[PDB]
Symmetry: D3
Subunit: 242 residues, 6 copies
């Protein structure tokens, strides 16, 4: 028909449905584990690349610090490039300094105790890295060295192996690591999303209501508190030139 | 999903099209934006999957006698051997000689829309096409006899119930000469094509409609080979 | 000859002449109203995309707010993406939040009383939208919520239907809407440009002297006063997830 | 401007070229930058409008015997069947076998510049081109006889008054063997071409000079068909 | 470096490949990332220098009977006349009919890796390829007889000492039927190819190994001409 | 083998070796002086484009100021576009305002007294230009006009004509211009890098230890002190519209 009545709710439905279908497709179409993971990870990266403010980059990467320690391979890194160099780039493959990182996520097909623990380990391999911070020159003078921002960590999946999907067994698994490996938020595209409440010191699960869109908004809102990354001391990395 | 499946690949190709056409229709509550969204989905399918000898875009078509077509939502045309007549950023005018196929893309099939599509197809087929002898590695071919331009209609839905039944068949039989549609797709229901042997339209229900249409188009395009060789000096008569 | 004497004035002449010719071409070559408008609008967008500082995006878009209200289709939106998400993106089509908007313009072929009023209505459909504003975390602490910036509005044309082109009838039309629909500035590529003087509370017309370049500089200078958009409350949009 | 017009489309195509070449000349008051600006306008015209079987770029040309050309402002060449000999970011060296046409692009025609262009064209035509039997769907063609390489000059203005008169004609008749120019364009005035039937140069005044030249080039290129099939192992003799 | 040199251009082409493959191996201390880095170097060489009639990418291959290959590091295939079977962002599945050549790219040659490559090549050659009569400007060709699919191995180093000696020769003679390798490159040492006349493998030492391999590949590909014309309706049997 | 032990030192080695080889290739392969220079200059530009924070642009350009004066052609300009327009852009050719410039470099094949003096002249042609600076609106109010930042100047080469490469004759040449033409830093890819020490008011040479990487880090660290360019007064350029 010729009726036209704009709906904001429909936009958020369509945003989520696109993610859910493409993740379902990646799982069903690719019967090779490498291709299936690459396909799914790309769906999440495209969502962040499309919708996050441009102050954020989103890509697969290794993280490195000025002590010469490296993270594991991170499926989805959210990081700064406005104020931060790459440490190494070779064609499309990138290694980013720890000081550039805002958030790190593991992306897999279905939530489980083993996957949650694996994600907790990936996140810990980033949070253990050392980050420098120098006083920051700006138009109004020089700020003190910014105190180190929290790196957000999380888990992104299509499905859940538990029944109910987002129940006590998921909660138990999340409480397995409340320090270096703590997962601040995550999304189960077929069911809902979760986040850690700092005030109550507990995990909250939110069911349905456009899970991928709700996760995206939660990520944007939480990132706002981080402001910009602290200012990197590239000469700390330069000790390794000799 | 135990193992690789061609059926699954073709289902996923179609489901992507069906869902994005539905998103275009639901999300964009403005007639211009809704049309642009839906047309872009169909163009993207053609751009991704057609052999690279084919271009797919929105364009006007014009001939060397100064006859212009209406704006065509989805033109399939040659660029390997054919110039543009005019390009201004994203707006293109292509010579009639370059055209392989023309489609109208809309939300839902109806008697008015089938007729509209037939008229659009006829407007392109009525344009004059030059054809020169063709130099090639082995010598010079005689001028290629003119290829038929394929025509069709692409929609998300059908206004009829049943969607792809006798009323649709009646509309398609409304133009059996230079507006005749060769094929088309209703993403939510099936596809149709003209069967030249039986001189009748056939409908195929379900069975991955967008992918079925894509394959029908590729197979039929093969018979056209490459476009005839344009006489650009026929257009050059308008320089003076 | 082999003479070389750089001229800054010539650069600004060439910048304007390019715009004037391409707008004239769009009008003459495309005898289909949709194609003609798309061609012309693209000329103005390319000028802004080429020359504006990269903190500004310029594109055709719909604007939406956290109350679920939508603007009309805006030919030329100038908006933030460094700090602002898209609300929806589908291939090249975008819907931006009201909080991201710096300026909105209507682009048409020739200035007239009807076109000025139409542009005033387009601008009003944006200014009526609600914009959130949160306290802003930064390297030096937290700023108060930034007071809402003015959205600049305007009209971009190739020609004028009036004789003289930029005379009292144009002035009358501009004074038709001095609130939600007020046009702050605009350009008539073949004749000159206009702007509203806040101190004198009157419209000023400037004839010739590279109209498109003069408009571009006026826009850059006025945008500088706006600083960056206020910080969006994406959770205000998230009320529509349920 | 009541209705669509091919004449208007061709006028707008030309006016865009003429104005941007004038901008390049006026705005960039540095000889390197001015040349780069003007050359890029001509390359953009060719890139936009030539059939995609043609590439257009600045390049050096080299043959399998180690003979190198000078740097050529505008080379029209094949990539569908031809490798690069060397590419380093934006700098390319193409095999002689890939070349369809070579142009010098400068600000204003003059006796010195016509001669310069003739010399550049001869330097490419003097390079050796291999040609092997060509496998194709129907079998194997004999080696294609070598295609003539087209040569020309592209400018914004003319130093002469009249712009395209007897002095220009005298300069063009200065090289009637391997430096002979086939065609060229003076954007502000007209275009020229060698008429093989009359064995004389012809000038066409006004009537959308850049577009007229574009069409002349497309029509003449058609006679060349595709480049001969390169013997890359002739170049491979230099591996040892 | 007094003057232009084809030998130098070919040395620089090779040195770029050799150094970047060594960088991939040294710098990326993770097996997935190391492989991705090295594979991308070889793909970039092919993308830059092969004629544009060839695509080069990582892909799965599938046929119209539902037989799927393993993931192939470097597939050389047609897109001018061939659709994708499936594309999802960067992941592609190509029809067997589109394939010209298949390579495995790894760090260092070894008996296990030569065997692995032979198996990968056989898996693609065992897939069924359709071939239809081909419409063209002059009429219709008979269906093109199936082209041989070229196979090979690309590495940076060799595990053997000598690098390209009898042990390598023994490994290559391990598969002389549908897994037989046609050619390959060891960037640090040389290249190899199967000599059909002598029915033996030949090794070429030094003399710009990557460039020598590139030229060998281009020359051999020429004999294949273009892929046969796919019957997409054979794939369409899986729509139901 | 299957061993995996990440090394930060190796990344910096590979970064430098890539530059050294590609510069060596440009010199050896292209026996035409224009092509050879274009090839080499492109190597340095790609390094800066790849690794510098995205607040910096790196390209070949002419610089112009609001008095209508122009620099010479600058091989490698590092400049702002986040807050700065182009003055003119024609296809890929750009003219940038002086207010946008952070650093300027000359790139040539081999260091020599003549090349150092030529580079000093290029740098001086930029530093002599006039730069405006306006009070800066931001989320916290209005900063005073930022005091003009130093423009960094330098020389980038593959080789040195002197033996030793980085010896007293290089030092003498560098001390030829300690004002408008002073070279703050530079790189000789085959040998080392140099920088001016402000405290000691002398030039320092550092040999080997990944020269291009050491130069890159020195540039990043020094640029940090400059903060963002001052805010341009585009209306100063607008005086040339009439
Ligand atoms: Cl009609
Ligand atoms: Cl010569
Ligand atoms: Cl097998």
């Amino acid at each position: 028909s010729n009726a036209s009545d704009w709906s904001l709710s429909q936009l958020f439905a369509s945003l989520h449905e696109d993610i859910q279908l493409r993740l379902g497709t990646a799982r069903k179409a690719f019967q090779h584990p490498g291709a299936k993971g690459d396909a799914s990870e790309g769906v999440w990266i495209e969502m962040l690349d499309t919708y996050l403010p441009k102050r954020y980059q989103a890509a697969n990467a290794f993280v490195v610090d000025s002590l010469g320690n490296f993270s594991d391979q991170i499926n989805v890194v959210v990081f700064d490039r406005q104020y931060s160099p790459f440490i190494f780039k070779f064609n499309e493959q990138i290694i980013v300094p720890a000081e550039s990182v805002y958030a790190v996520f593991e992306a897999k097909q279905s939530a489980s105790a083993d996957l949650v623990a694996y994600a907790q380990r990936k996140v810990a391999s980033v949070r253990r890295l050392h980050r420098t911070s120098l006083p920051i020159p700006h138009a109004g003078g020089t700020y003190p060295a910014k105190p180190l921002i929290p790196i957000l960590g999380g888990l992104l999946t299509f499905e859940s192996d538990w029944s109910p999907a987002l129940g006590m067994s998921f909660d138990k698994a999340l409480n397995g690591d409340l320090s270096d490996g703590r997962l601040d938020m995550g999304c189960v595209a077929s069911h809902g999303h979760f986040y850690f409440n700092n005030i109550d010191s507990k995990f909250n699960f939110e069911h349905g209501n456009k899970p991928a869109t709700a996760f995206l908004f939660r990520l944007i809102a939480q990132l706002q508190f981080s402001g910009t990354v602290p200012m990197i001391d590239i000469d700390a990395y330069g000790k390794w030139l000799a």
